[PDB]
Amino acid sequence: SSPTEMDENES
Amino acid sequence: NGIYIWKIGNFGMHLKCQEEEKPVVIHSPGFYTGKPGYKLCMRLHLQLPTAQRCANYISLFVHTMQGEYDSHLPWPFQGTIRLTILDQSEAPVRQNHEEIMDAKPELLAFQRPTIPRNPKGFGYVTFMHLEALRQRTFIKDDTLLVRCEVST
């Protein structure tokens, strides 16, 4: 329900 | 006002990969919010059945990219992004699956990228569960449509 920041290199 | 519709064909094969616990991570072509404007793309995950808490979800993120106009544009990026998985039934019977988010200029995902695609994306880990796809005609002719509308 709420957006987040994620790194495509898995961390 | 940038609008891009991402057509993901051969979708059944991607679902089969997910069912066999093979990672599915795909990226849209790059698209501009305008000319001049920002370059962005979408990243879509089919989370594996063995994933921690988001197993069997579609994840959908937006990434900034290095674009032709970056030197002439203000940074960080600010604006509003609407992400929609389109319901491909007829108009009277249709309900898209949609979220709308404000960009956060404080985040590294919205700073000017230094490599072709900014590794930090911003979006929804649990955008849409795979089982929700079966409730309306989201897949038509083996194709999912993912629409991205960007305001400023």
Side-chain angles (χ1 to χ4, degrees), chain A residues 1-5 7-9, chain B residues 1-6 8-15 17-51 54-89 91-152:
Chain A
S1 207
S2 153
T4 55
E5 211 185 31
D7 191 295
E8 76 185 24
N9 297 320
Chain B
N1 206 277
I3 309 182
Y4 184 76
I5 293 179
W6 181 16
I8 310 175
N10 213 21
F11 195 71
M13 176 275 272
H14 295 83
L15 292 177
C17 286
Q18 190 275 345
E19 287 167 350
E20 294 163 16
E21 317 189 351
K22 306 182 167 132
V24 173
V25 185
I26 59 179
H27 293 91
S28 81
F31 53 93
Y32 279 90
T33 61
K35 295 182 178 164
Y38 300 86
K39 215 206 185 163
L40 312 171
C41 71
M42 270 172 300
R43 156 169 68 108
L44 183 148
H45 286 234
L46 301 188
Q47 307 272 169
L48 288 191
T50 57
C54 56
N56 312 123
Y57 272 92
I58 304 177
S59 315
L60 186 55
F61 300 90
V62 180
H63 297 244
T64 56
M65 309 181 67
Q66 292 186 131
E68 283 293 314
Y69 307 100
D70 287 356
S71 295
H72 302 271
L73 300 169
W75 297 92
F77 176 95
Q78 303 186 41
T80 301
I81 302 182
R82 177 200 267 90
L83 297 167
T84 312
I85 281 172
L86 294 181
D87 183 357
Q88 300 189 65
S89 35
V93 278
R94 171 181 312 160
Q95 180 180 286
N96 298 331
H97 189 88
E98 192 164 271
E99 302 289 356
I100 175 178
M101 66 200 257
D102 290 328
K104 286 170 171 253
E106 63 259 48
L107 296 169
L108 296 108
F110 292 107
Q111 322 289 317
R112 167 176 191 180
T114 65
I115 65 182
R117 184 180 63 242
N118 189 329
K120 297 253 181 299
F122 193 61
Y124 299 85
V125 176
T126 55
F127 184 74
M128 193 188 192
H129 190 107
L130 283 174
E131 292 297 272
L133 284 178
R134 326 238 289 269
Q135 285 298 311
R136 302 180 174 274
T137 37
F138 290 107
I139 296 164
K140 195 195 179 198
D141 297 336
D142 207 27
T143 302
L144 185 86
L145 308 175
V146 182
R147 169 196 198 263
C148 173
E149 184 176 1
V150 176
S151 175
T152 207

